[PDB]
Amino acid sequence: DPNFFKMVEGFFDRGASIVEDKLVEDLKTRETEEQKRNRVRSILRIIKPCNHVLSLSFPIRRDDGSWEVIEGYRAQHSQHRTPCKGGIRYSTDVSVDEVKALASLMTYKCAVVDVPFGGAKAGVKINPKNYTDNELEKITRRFTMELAKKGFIGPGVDVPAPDMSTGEREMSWIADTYASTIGHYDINAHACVTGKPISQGGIHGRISATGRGVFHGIENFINEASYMSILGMTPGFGDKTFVVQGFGNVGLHSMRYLHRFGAKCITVGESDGSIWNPDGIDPKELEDFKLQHGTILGFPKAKIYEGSILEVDCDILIPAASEKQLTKSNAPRVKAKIIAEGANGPTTPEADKIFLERNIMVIPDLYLNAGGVTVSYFEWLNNLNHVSYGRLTFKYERDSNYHLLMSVQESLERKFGKHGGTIPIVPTAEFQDRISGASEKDIVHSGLAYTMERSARQIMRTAMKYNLGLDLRTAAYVNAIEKVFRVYNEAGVTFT
Amino acid sequence: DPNFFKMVEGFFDRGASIVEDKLVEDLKTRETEEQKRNRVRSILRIIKPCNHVLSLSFPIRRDDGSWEVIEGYRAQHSQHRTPCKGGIRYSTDVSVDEVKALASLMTYKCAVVDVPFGGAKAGVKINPKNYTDNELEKITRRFTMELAKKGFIGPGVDVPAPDMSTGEREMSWIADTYASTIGHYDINAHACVTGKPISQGGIHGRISATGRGVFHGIENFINEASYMSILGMTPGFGDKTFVVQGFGNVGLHSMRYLHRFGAKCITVGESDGSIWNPDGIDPKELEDFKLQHGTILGFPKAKIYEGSILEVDCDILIPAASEKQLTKSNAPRVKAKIIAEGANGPTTPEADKIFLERNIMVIPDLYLNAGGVTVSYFEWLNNLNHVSYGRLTFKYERDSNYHLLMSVQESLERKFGKHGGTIPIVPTAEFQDRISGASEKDIVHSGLAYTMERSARQIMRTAMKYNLGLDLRTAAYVNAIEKVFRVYNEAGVTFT
Amino acid sequence: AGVKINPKNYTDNELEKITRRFTMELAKKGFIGPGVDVPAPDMSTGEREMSWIADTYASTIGHYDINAHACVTGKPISQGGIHGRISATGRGVFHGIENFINEASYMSILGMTPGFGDKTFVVQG
Amino acid sequence: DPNFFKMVEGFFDRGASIVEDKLVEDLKTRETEEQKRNRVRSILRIIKPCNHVLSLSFPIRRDDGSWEVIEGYRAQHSQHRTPCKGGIRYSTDVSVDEVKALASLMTYKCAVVDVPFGGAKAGVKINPKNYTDNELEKITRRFTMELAKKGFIGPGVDVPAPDMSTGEREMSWIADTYASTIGHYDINAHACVTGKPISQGGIHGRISATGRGVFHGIENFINEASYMSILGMTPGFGDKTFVVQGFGNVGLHSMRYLHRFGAKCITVGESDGSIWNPDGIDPKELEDFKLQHGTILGFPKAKIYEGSILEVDCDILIPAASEKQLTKSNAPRVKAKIIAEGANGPTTPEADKIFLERNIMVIPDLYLNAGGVTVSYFEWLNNLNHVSYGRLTFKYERDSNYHLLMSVQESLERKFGKHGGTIPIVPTAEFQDRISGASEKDIVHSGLAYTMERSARQIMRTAMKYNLGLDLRTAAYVNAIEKVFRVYNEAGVTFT
Ligand SMILES: NC(=O)C1=CN([C@@H]2O[C@H](COP(=O)(O)OP(=O)(O)OC[C@H]3O[C@@H](n4cnc5c(N)ncnc54)[C@H](O)[C@@H]3O)[C@@H](O)[C@H]2O)C=CC1
Ligand SMILES: NC(=O)C1=CN([C@@H]2O[C@H](COP(=O)(O)OP(=O)(O)OC[C@H]3O[C@@H](n4cnc5c(N)ncnc54)[C@H](O)[C@@H]3O)[C@@H](O)[C@H]2O)C=CC1
Ligand SMILES: NC(=O)C1=CN([C@@H]2O[C@H](COP(=O)(O)OP(=O)(O)OC[C@H]3O[C@@H](n4cnc5c(N)ncnc54)[C@H](O)[C@@H]3O)[C@@H](O)[C@H]2O)C=CC1
Ligand SMILES: NC(=O)C1=CN([C@@H]2O[C@H](COP(=O)(O)OP(=O)(O)OC[C@H]3O[C@@H](n4cnc5c(N)ncnc54)[C@H](O)[C@@H]3O)[C@@H](O)[C@H]2O)C=CC1
Ligand SMILES: NC(=O)C1=CN([C@@H]2O[C@H](COP(=O)(O)OP(=O)(O)OC[C@H]3O[C@@H](n4cnc5c(N)ncnc54)[C@H](O)[C@@H]3O)[C@@H](O)[C@H]2O)C=CC1
Ligand SMILES: NC(=O)C1=CN([C@@H]2O[C@H](COP(=O)(O)OP(=O)(O)OC[C@H]3O[C@@H](n4cnc5c(N)ncnc54)[C@H](O)[C@@H]3O)[C@@H](O)[C@H]2O)C=CC1
Ligand SMILES: Nc1nc2c(ncn2[C@@H]2O[C@H](COP(=O)(O)OP(=O)(O)OP(=O)(O)O)[C@@H](O)[C@H]2O)c(=O)[nH]1
Ligand SMILES: Nc1nc2c(ncn2[C@@H]2O[C@H](COP(=O)(O)OP(=O)(O)OP(=O)(O)O)[C@@H](O)[C@H]2O)c(=O)[nH]1
Ligand SMILES: Nc1nc2c(ncn2[C@@H]2O[C@H](COP(=O)(O)OP(=O)(O)OP(=O)(O)O)[C@@H](O)[C@H]2O)c(=O)[nH]1
Ligand SMILES: Nc1nc2c(ncn2[C@@H]2O[C@H](COP(=O)(O)OP(=O)(O)OP(=O)(O)O)[C@@H](O)[C@H]2O)c(=O)[nH]1
């Protein structure tokens, strides 16, 4: 077990090393080889550390009257591409070392999936099992009056997001503050945080986002004859059978969505139990019982088959659970053919060899969980240009679309003036929904998948470019660094 | 040896404990005893930690072309009394733990000597023996474009100051930046740093300040019959003989100034040698040789008497050298009667007992070295109201003063119309200087001593109030906390 | 905006020291800013230059603005450019002619036959 | 006749050349001689040109309804010492070449008399004999909404002042605008212009300032035995007899004030006539007739003695008239012993030799007319700290002063308990005024002269330092450059 800071740190170190040779060859500015190679070895030392790390302390007054101090952190990994964005964690485990760590990932997520954001992360040492509906407000509404006074929250400088122990309810309290004290003289005030309640400028699909992100991740590689063959796998969701490592906000949806396209959810689990039914499991019923019973350990149409799901038959596995689900202490017990990581750091770097040595493909946790990030990047636009997506232009396409068919029909009337008479070219039931069920929702559902598409190809292009083969994690971090480098390389970073 | 963070931390912990009882008695707002006592025990937990701690990283490009990263810190101990102020250290030893530490002291210095400043401190990990006349500019001029973008430099939010390895030359580069990029639209831009070169808005006496601060420190207690008797000491500088622990920017002046009032400088030393001449030593000659020879180890009218000055005869000792000159490992070897500390943390808390047990008085390093701070507080005013001190009103008093004597003379002409005839009431040679040698300089030299005066009495009043007797350090930290508490107690600190 | 410089004199670095200064001046006097004024490339001013400008205005003054990087155009595509910033002017010239050579009201009066597929042209450089 | 731009330009060119050698010797930073000498020859190329020159054009709509364009200029000679300050001229002669010129002078005036201002100047092409009480408002109130939108007016960036065709009435219209549109959110808004009407934040003595400036100029050199002897002149105003070249806002006062100290105003003149009465002339009567008759050509107690006053007996001459009163075409016709220039460029550089060759002293027009500048620098402080000078502290000194005498009296009661009994030490009639006639006025009258004093000595020190002897103009420009250089030399001018 490494430090999750150190464990991620080591990743791009590898990635930096690999691109290193290729990159000097690719740069063109006429310089000395050693110079324009020690150059990139120097820029790549700039990208590694975080550029700002803020520590705080709060005079919070409790409900009983007493006071207490709240150690709270904030780190912006790089002003590389403003505005920085990252979640806000509430947990006593939060330490400045971990905040630096995540800030790194958020900077490379955004690089992967091409969203113009830097990377941030912020924690506070609070166990929300202690405070009330009210003290949390007195805290969050204070943790923003601090950051804002020091330029670490603002629609153009930095944008918080939800994290564990940080629901919608919280992010409302933030915006309700920054848009009332400091950002008041700004048109873009409510663009300060994402994941707001849909009433106050949210996005439909902020919850199911990450899950439906995981989905379009797999669908961009399972449709690749260049890997499915090499993986010894048959292309198609309708062909394969998968499993799930829990029922997080991810699992509940990642399951259901992939469930919707014929891939058979073999088994599932819990943070405190196991479930197994090797012949397909119903999402919705679970979505009932896990909320009807507070646990599916007792879902009747399955079995509590104690044991790691990670050791159970599956053509696709989703470690949709918390940190470090895998070590090489079970790498000989994968039972899978393709693993697509759900949360950050589920696998040690160690076992990653063995999976390659056992010849499978473990899609990296970089961009899979980054489905949510893009959705935030959309809510940060919805709020930014002050208009629901496409409300301006919804009835327009509705008009034109079946004001276009009416031409095809009319144009067929030439050849078929009397053969069959009138020919009512009409939509279908489905294509009627995409007309009548028009909503910003479907824009997201659309824009989301396409970002994942163009992204996931940028990786398969990378793996081919460096013969990494089934080394996606590296290639990903390679593909991220390749991008972040371009920005510095041209910025003439020296502002003096 | 403790951590200098922890070692200072422990100080006011004692101080907080002592005032604790007296303070609840002194508060009047009608509340429950346990409540309005757990109150103060809670406010006193707020004051301890720092409210902001910033960490940085710089893409500095060297002279040869290469890049490198510059870890740089900044800490504002409390927004208690804006604007915060503290020096900027250059040294590889700088670590976020020490930056928090000093930030505490600067907050209690200012509390002692009644200057409305919070407390800050900032380091960078640089050994200036590495860089050039130019890279330092490329660094400092960058370490301000960062802080300024995040609200940690600004004439109303925070004000840097010189520290070790940070001469005038540096502080110019800062102001030359903040007053050219961000603060440009501000009238108060050049109030951003103090210790600027006198040309660019400095103060005459910025160098000799700290020394002449040490002086008026002692003169406020050595003139106290309540202690000089108890110390078994004869009131008067013309009576006592002292020593000096080095020739810092402090010693060169603290010596010379106290030299000017009949107190006999017995011996002196160096960071790399000893000197002794138990019958008075000439400042100026040393101020020659230490600059003529780069060392006084060879000053002819003295001797290189190797051994700790701290173990040499003296009625007053000045540990005007770097951190932790004393432990109890020589507490039985004080040889002194009154010790007045020059730099921060020269003595372990341990030995402080023994000095009390050996019945001497060790004046705390809190306010002695804080002579310089006030002088900075003046340069921050000179720059603030855009006018040399008293240039507006210099010739006015010059007029009135000897337009007043001319009345006394003329009024004597009544009683003495013919007894002695004309009676030229005139000034003296000295009082002529205070007229003709009028300068902002003399204002400082004046305002400085009076701040030290009113301060040093606030301590002797405190020691009497709590029967601390010869416990000045405590009483000082007690007197500081007493003040800083008042501000929070009334602020209704909750901004939400 | 011009400056009196013959870029055949200075280096990869002095030009930076110049351009990055010619913006700290204008910006202090309200002549650069995404809502007040927007530079663009000209002769002896490639992409490389316009990067140095934005890299400055979006780091000293416009830092507290969401629209900072809107200060100049023709930036390198990495830093917020547009694909087709180079070939633009040319493909501009094209759609110019195509809007008049398809005009029977002029092609006739010009004694000209409407259509690109019909005509033969030349180029001055 | 040279271009007044070129003619001033040439001045400091000489001055730059002279200091050039001395200055490299004086700098200490260890560098190569040729390097740290080409250094100063390079800094001295920076100081020469203006750093900003703005040209404008106004859609002014006339009273009749028509439109017209108003070419208007503005030039800030150097951001060297913010805020820049200069007058606003209305005249059709105004051209960008002349605006650059004056901006230079205002930068060296301020350098001479030690007021922390840069230098500016602004004209518009208007002949105010054309427009009305109202169009001028529509113009001025527009020429500020333009400059303000581009950072050329503002209490910390730039400060206009009155010039020819620009009375109080105008400067009110400016402040009434900048303090109502843009500077509204600033506490320092009304500090934007000086010379405002006394009601709206002016200074008593804004008119008579320049004149009473000319006065304390001469009084600082005519009291110099080092020159009065060398000039073959007898020290004292009560000894000498002078003349005046007109009755400008300068002459009306420069005459009267020097009139008040026994120097005999021999003759005077007009822009359209001559006057002569070689036996002393009354200011006030002229101040009547020139306003009773609109001309003194007919003042009964003198004669209309046509001919250049510059060719008439005088121990002191004041060319208090407009540009280029002298050439060498009358240099053999000086008739004077000391000439003290009133307005800018009254003498060609050519004749200056001849005066030296005829062995007289022509005090430069740099600082003589700069008496007004300092007074503006005070109104820019009065407005800045929002309090009449000394109103806070007037009754305090009044108390202490004759609460001090009452001690001297009482203390004499010891020696003289019965010799003469009660001894009423009282003020005099005069010293009573300085008590009862206490006013911000007298502060100015005081602070003014002292600035001129400390200034005029900085010149006599300079002339001695470079053996310039009776070369004051040069020495002045030398003394200015010496100062302006210090600021750049230390600023590390490179902000990148
Ligand atoms: N030639 C290649 O390998 C690639 C080309 N592209 C081109 O760029 C376009 C896509 O770029 P968009 O971002 O959608 O539009 P854009 O105009 O904002 O492109 C900005 C560029 O910066 C990079 N970038 C994006 N987000 C970043 C971040 N957070 N940090 C650092 N770098 C980042 C992207 O590679 C992108 O090419 C496509 O049209 C495609 O033609 C994109 C990716 C790879
Ligand atoms: N919620 C969001 O918007 C995002 C969440 N994530 C990450 O996703 C992960 C969890 O997703 P959440 O959204 O937090 O959903 P959640 O909080 O609702 O997830 C908890 C689920 O994981 C299960 N679980 C926990 N430990 C397990 C273990 N060792 N084995 C099997 N099941 C286990 C629980 O029983 C439960 O079903 C975390 O790593 C979180 O940081 C990442 C990005 C966004
Ligand atoms: N009754 C007492 O024990 C004391 C009374 N005083 C009174 O206050 C006046 C002196 O205060 P000034 O500061 O010169 O004027 P001021 O009007 O600014 O006083 C502010 C008050 O806040 C406190 N203070 C000053 N600097 C501080 C800092 N950096 N942090 C926290 N608290 C700070 C001081 O005790 C002062 O009384 C004197 O006239 C005296 O009458 C001052 C000290 C002790
Ligand atoms: N310079 C300033 O404005 C301020 C300085 N200080 C503190 O004062 C102390 C030193 O004063 P500086 O101004 O830095 O002067 P400096 O840097 O010129 O002081 C160095 C002097 O101390 C002597 N020295 C060093 N270690 C010694 C040891 N163990 N025994 C005897 N002599 C020793 C050296 O030989 C030398 O004479 C430091 O603690 C510094 O932080 C504190 C506040 C302001
Ligand atoms: N050693 C010398 O030759 C001189 C020394 N001084 C010292 O400086 C003090 C007077 O300076 P103040 O301005 O009253 O206070 P200050 O603290 O503002 O001094 C600023 C310094 O910058 C220079 N300066 C002033 N106005 C300037 C301008 N507009 N442009 C460029 N440089 C300018 C002055 O020479 C002054 O020494 C006196 O106390 C005197 O001791 C002043 C003049 C000459
Ligand atoms: N008024 C002010 O605040 C300042 C005025 N000045 C300068 O002072 C000069 C004039 O002083 P103003 O204040 O404008 O007063 P003004 O406008 O009232 O001066 C005009 C006076 O000069 C006389 N005059 C004009 N040409 C003459 C000539 N060739 N020979 C003899 N007398 C002549 C007129 O008859 C009249 O008495 C100008 O050069 C102006 O720029 C400079 C700084 C400030
Ligand atoms: N489908 C589904 N939605 C849920 C569930 N629990 C909460 N939700 C919320 O209900 C919303 C339903 O989304 P809809 O807009 O009605 O339908 P959709 O977006 O086309 O697809 P689904 O989200 O899967 O229903 C989601 O956005 C979730 O935020 C669940 O168990 N299943
Ligand atoms: N006196 C003194 N001043 C020094 C010495 N070295 C440098 N200086 C500087 O020279 C200045 C001399 O100060 P002055 O204004 O001339 O005289 P003063 O302020 O009345 O008292 P001193 O500073 O002790 O001379 C001080 O401000 C120091 O900054 C030194 O060895 N002795
Ligand atoms: N076509 C073309 N492109 C060039 C040439 N030289 C540089 N380029 C660049 O290459 C890019 C090619 O554009 P593409 O996006 O690949 O293709 P296109 O925009 O559909 O049309 P073209 O620009 O003509 O290729 C252009 O935007 C130019 O900036 C050239 O000689 N021909
Ligand atoms: N003395 C004098 N003042 C005039 C004259 N014309 C206008 N004034 C104004 O009247 C004011 C008179 O100033 P006061 O404050 O009353 O007296 P003072 O300042 O001590 O000296 P004077 O200005 O010479 O009277 C001056 O400030 C001028 O602005 C004049 O001819 N003589």
For residue D331, what are the CA distances in angstroms to A439, D6, D212, D311, D356? Answer: 92, 22, 28, 9, 10
* HSE-CB of D464 using CA atoms within 13 angstroms: 9
> CA C67, CA C63: separation in Å to the nearest integer?
9
Residues at the binding site of D for ADP are 388, 454
> CA D484, CA D47: separation in Å to the nearest integer?
8
Are the CB atoms for A316 and A243 separated by under 8 Å? yes
> CA C72, CA C23: separation in Å to the nearest integer?
11
User: For chain D, first and last CA: distance in Å?
Assistant: 42
Query: Backbone dihedral region of A42: left (phi > 0), alpha (psi from -120 to 50 degrees) or beta?
Result: alpha
Coil, helix or strand for B255? helix
Q: Among A18, A25, A60, which Cα is nearest to A146's?
A: A60
Is there a contact between D496 and C28 if contact means CB atoms under 8 Å apart?
no
D121 catalytically annotated: yes
Q: Among A299, A281, A291, which Cα is nearest to A243's?
A: A281
Residue B259 CA from chain centroid, whole number: 20
Task: Indicate the top mutation candidate among B194, B249, B287, B308 to test ligand 4's pocket, ranked by most ligand atoms within 8 A of CB.
Answer: B249
DSSP code, position D418: S
A114 CA → ligand 1 middle, Å? 6
Give the residue from B180, B411, B412, B423 with the most D CB atoms within 10 Å of its CB, the best one to mutate.
B411
Nearest atom (ligand 10) to Cα of D256: 24
Is there a contact between C78 and A487 if contact means CB atoms under 8 Å apart?
yes
| Final resolution, Å | 3.6
Q: What's at D284, amino acid-wise?
A: K
Query: Backbone dihedral region of D382: left (phi > 0), alpha (psi from -120 to 50 degrees) or beta?
Result: alpha
In sequence order, what are the beta bridge partners of B56? A52, B72
Query: Does the annotation place A391 within a ligand binding site?
Result: no
Query: Does the annotation place C83 within a ligand binding site?
Result: yes
What topology is assigned to A52-200 in CATH?
Answer: Rossmann fold (3.40.50)
Are the CB atoms for B277 and B301 separated by under 8 Å? yes
- In chain A, which residues have their Cβ closer than 8 Å to the Cβ of D496? 495-496
* HSE-CB of D297 using CA atoms within 13 angstroms: 11
What topology is assigned to A201-496 in CATH?
Answer: Rossmann fold (3.40.50)
Coil, helix or strand for D74? strand
Domain residue spans of chain A: 1-51, 52-200, 201-496
Q: For residue D33, give every residue at least 6 positions away whose Cβ sits within 8 Å of its Cβ, in sequence order, or none.
A: D24
Crossing angle (nearest 10°) for helices D440-465 and B394-401: 100
Tokens standing for residue D101: 């010129």
Are the CB atoms for B369 and B87 separated by under 8 Å? no
Q: For residue A120, give every residue at least 6 positions away whose Cβ sits within 8 Å of its Cβ, in sequence order, or none.
A: A74, A75, A76, A77, A84, A85, A86, A103, A106, A152, A158, A159, A160
Query: Backbone dihedral region of B308: left (phi > 0), alpha (psi from -120 to 50 degrees) or beta?
Result: beta
Give the residue from C19, C24, C29, C61 with the most D CB atoms within 10 Å of its CB, the best one to mutate.
C29
Crossing angle (nearest 10°) for helices D251-259 and D209-218: 50
Q: Among B224, B222, B179, which Cα is nearest to B201's?
A: B179
> CA C108, CA A143: separation in Å to the nearest integer?
74
In sequence order, what DSSP letters do the residues of B406-463 get, joined into one string?
HHHHHHHHHHTSSSS--------HHHHHHHHT--HHHHHHHHHHHHHHHHHHHHHHHH
**Closest to C79 (Cβ–Cβ): which among A29, A156, A490?**
A490
Are the CB atoms for D249 and D211 separated by under 8 Å? yes
In sequence order, what are the beta bridge partners of D347? D326
At CB < 8 Å, which residues of chain A contact D? 495-496
A52-200 shares the fold of A1-51: no
Q: Considering the candidates B121, B240, B264, B290, report the single residue annotated as catalytic.
A: B121
Q: Among B384, B380, B483, B488, which Cα is nearest to B110's?
A: B483
Are the CB atoms for D447 and B391 separated by under 8 Å? yes
Coil, helix or strand for B140? helix
Q: Among A171, A210, A152, A144, which Cα is nearest to A383's?
A: A171
Are the CB atoms for B211 and B377 separated by under 8 Å? no
Neighbours of A122 (CB within 10 A): 29
Last residue before each gap in chain D (C to N over 2.5 A): none
Is there a contact between C66 and A495 if contact means CB atoms under 8 Å apart?
no
Coil, helix or strand for D210? helix
Neighbours of D201 (CB within 10 A): 18
Tokens standing for residue A422: 């009138």
Are the CB atoms for A335 and A309 separated by under 8 Å? no
Q: Exposed, middle or buried: residue B217 (CB in 10 Å: 0-12, 13-18, 19+)?
A: buried
Are the CB atoms for D342 and D322 separated by under 8 Å? no
> CA A265, CA A244: separation in Å to the nearest integer?
7
> CA A37, CA A23: separation in Å to the nearest integer?
9
Atom 32 of ligand 9: nearest residue by CA position: C87
> CA D492, CA A278: separation in Å to the nearest integer?
75
Are the CB atoms for B400 and B422 separated by under 8 Å? no
To the nearest whole Å, the CA of C39 is away from the closest chain A CA by 17
Which own/partner contact pairs does A14-20 have at CB distance under 8 Å and 24+ positions apart? A14/A474, A14/A477, A15/A474, A15/A477, A15/A478, A15/A480, A15/A481, A16/A44, A16/A47, A16/A481, A18/A466, A18/A474, A18/A478, A19/A478, A19/A481, A19/A482, A19/A485, A20/A44
Coil, helix or strand for D56? strand
Tokens standing for residue C78: 């990495």
- In chain D, which residues have their Cβ closer than 8 Å to the Cβ of A492? none
- What's the full length of chain D, in residues? 496
For residue B442, which phi and psi values (nearest 5 degrees)? -70, -25
> CA B255, CA B269: separation in Å to the nearest integer?
12
Tokens standing for residue A312: 């159970």
Q: Considering the candidates D100, D121, D138, D240, report the single residue annotated as catalytic.
A: D121
Q: Among A489, A494, A493, which Cα is nearest to A19's?
A: A489
Q: Which residues of B459-469 are buried (b: 16+ CB within 10 A; e: fewer)?
A: bbebbeebebe
**Closest to C28 (Cβ–Cβ): which among B145, B149, B184?**
B184
> CA A162, CA A88: separation in Å to the nearest integer?
6
Query: Does the annotation place A398 within a ligand binding site?
Result: no
Secondary structure of C38-87 as H, E, C letters = CCCCCCCCCHHHHHHHHHHHCCCCHHHCCCHHHCCCCCCHHHCCCCCCCC
Secondary structure of chain A as H, E, C letters = CCCHHHHHHHHHHHHHHHHHHHHHHHCCCCCCCCHHHHHHHHHHHHHCCCCEEEEECCEEECCCCCEEECCEEEEEEEHHHCCEEEEEEECCCCCHHHHHHHHHHHHHHHHHCCCCCCEEEEEECCCCCCCCCCHHHHHHHHHHHHHHHCCCCECCCEEEEECCCCCHHHHHHHHHHHCCCCHHHCCCHHHCCCCCCHHHCCCCCCCCHHHHHHHHHHCCCCCCHHHHCCCCCCCCHHHCEECCCCCCCCHHHHHHHHHCCCCEECEEEECCEEEECCCCCCHHHHHHHHHHCCCCCCCCCCECCCCCHHHCCCCEECCCCCCCCECCCCHHHCCCCEEECCCCCCECHHHHHHHHHCCCEEECHHHHCCHHHHHHHHHHHHCCCCCCCCCCCHHHHHHHHCCCHHHHHHHHHHHCCCCCCCCCCCCCHHHHHHHHCCCHHHHHHHHHHHHHHHHHHHHHHHHHHCCCCCCHHHHHHHHHHHHHHHHHHHHCCCCC
> CA A394, CA A371: separation in Å to the nearest integer?
25
CA angle A52, A56, A58 (to 5 degrees): 160
CATH 1.10.3720.10 for the A1-51 domain, yes or no: no
To the nearest whole Å, the CA of B146 is away from the closest chain C CA by 9
Are the CB atoms for B168 and B193 separated by under 8 Å? no
> CA A95, CA A90: separation in Å to the nearest integer?
11
- In chain A, which residues have their Cβ closer than 8 Å to the Cβ of C63? 157
Coil, helix or strand for D302? coil
- Strand pairing category for A59-61 and A72-78: unpaired
- H/E stretch holding D111 reads helix D96-112
Q: Which residues of A279-303 are buried (b: 16+ CB within 10 A; e: fewer)?
A: eebbbeebbebbeeeebbbebeebe
Way it was determined:
cryo-EM
